[PDB]
Design an enzyme around this catalytic site. Structure first.
Site, PDB file in Angstrom:
ATOM      1  N   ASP A  91       0.751   5.577   1.306  1.00 33.92           N
ATOM      2  CA  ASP A  91       0.102   6.581   2.140  1.00 33.92           C
ATOM      3  C   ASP A  91       0.131   7.883   1.332  1.00 33.92           C
ATOM      4  OD1 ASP A  91      -0.219   4.742   4.219  1.00 33.92           O
ATOM      5  OD2 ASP A  91       1.426   5.535   5.460  1.00 33.92           O
ATOM      6  N   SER A 135       0.839  -1.211   0.000  1.00 30.86           N
ATOM      7  CA  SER A 135       0.000   0.000   0.000  1.00 30.86           C
ATOM      8  C   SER A 135       0.882   1.273   0.000  1.00 30.86           C
ATOM      9  CB  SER A 135      -0.969   0.001   1.184  1.00 30.86           C
ATOM     10  OG  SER A 135      -0.295   0.195   2.423  1.00 30.86           O
TER      11      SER A 135
END
Lengths: 129, 161
Positions: free
Chosen positions: A52, A50
């Site tokens: 941010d 992932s």
């Protein structure tokens, strides 16, 4: 866009973050300093595939959709690209959804490690609010 | 042995952050790794500097804590003490050889941080130890630029040299 400390404090204040869910303004300013260095364009790859995004480093697996993250949940129902604006509205809205249901600002690793337990009101000192 | 060194290191990180002077000294005496790192890359010295525990800072430095240890953001204990406004900690770190112009991952020095927070007394100590007023961070800002952004008229005068 990169905010100045007092400029961000005033913007976060106008966006209703002061004492939101019991968290004084300084907490949000301190979190942004350590999460992104007040950079609305900050993007950082995590250890789990992932990324941010933005000034509050909203996560692409659980909270925003970037279309490139396995197991996307998109709980904020927002594209991660909407968190890369000079306007902090989308990041604020998503932070408010994260903090309402759970363990408060513990969702922010930089906040837990560098803001929690400190004199957070120092972050709003010298600002015109 | 390095296993117990690392294990007591974890207890040391917690004792340093909590301000438990006696526990810190006992852990060091028992062989705790003074340069142990938590998940954020913090050493016990970063945590004692962050939380304003002067006695723990002095004791960690006496037992060989790395004064210029960097965390995952590139911050040294000096960067953290500068942000928090812990003047006595800034002075002890400088006394033990802290790099006054250490740069983090955003090109910010302790001067940039003390300026941002408006810690006048810390700015003066950093300048005394050779802080570079012309140092620009990764967004092109000097400590002077930061003082102007925040409208700190006291700092603007002080940083003109």
């Amino acid at each position: 866009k990169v905010f100045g400390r007092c400029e961000l404090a005033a913007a976060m204040k106008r966006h209703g973050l002061d004492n939101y869910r019991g968290y004084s303004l300084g907490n949000w300013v301190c979190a942004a300093k350590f999460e992104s260095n007040f950079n609305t364009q900050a993007t950082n790859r995590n250890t789990d595939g992932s990324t941010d995004y933005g000034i509050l480093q909203i996560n692409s697996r659980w909270w925003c959709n970037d279309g490139r993250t396995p197991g996307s949940r998109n709980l904020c129902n927002i594209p991660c690209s909407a968190l890369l604006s000079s306007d902090i509205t989308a990041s604020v809205n998503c932070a408010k959804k994260i903090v309402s249901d759970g363990n408060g600002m513990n969702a922010w690793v930089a906040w837990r490690n560098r803001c929690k337990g400190t004199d957070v009101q120092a972050w709003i000192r010298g600002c015109r609010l | 042995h390095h296993h117990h060194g690392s294990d007591l290191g974890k207890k040391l990180l917690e004792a340093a952050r909590a301000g438990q002077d006696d526990e810190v000294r006992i852990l060091i005496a028992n062989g705790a790794d003074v340069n142990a790192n938590d998940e954020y890359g913090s050493t016990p010295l970063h945590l004692a500097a962050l939380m304003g525990h002067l006695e723990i800072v002095e004791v960690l430095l006496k037992y060989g804590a790395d004064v210029n240890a960097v965390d995952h953001a590139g911050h040294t204990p000096l960067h953290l003490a500068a942000i928090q406004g812990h003047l006595e900690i800034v002075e002890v770190l400088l006394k033990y050889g802290a790099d006054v112009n250490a740069v983090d991952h955003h090109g910010q020095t302790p001067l940039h941080l003390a300026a941002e927070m408006g810690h006048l007394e810390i700015v003066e100590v950093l300048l005394k130890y050779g802080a570079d007023v012309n140092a620009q961070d990764k967004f092109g800002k000097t400590a002077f630029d930061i003082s102007i952004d925040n409208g700190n008229e006291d700092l603007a005068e002080i940083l003109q040299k």
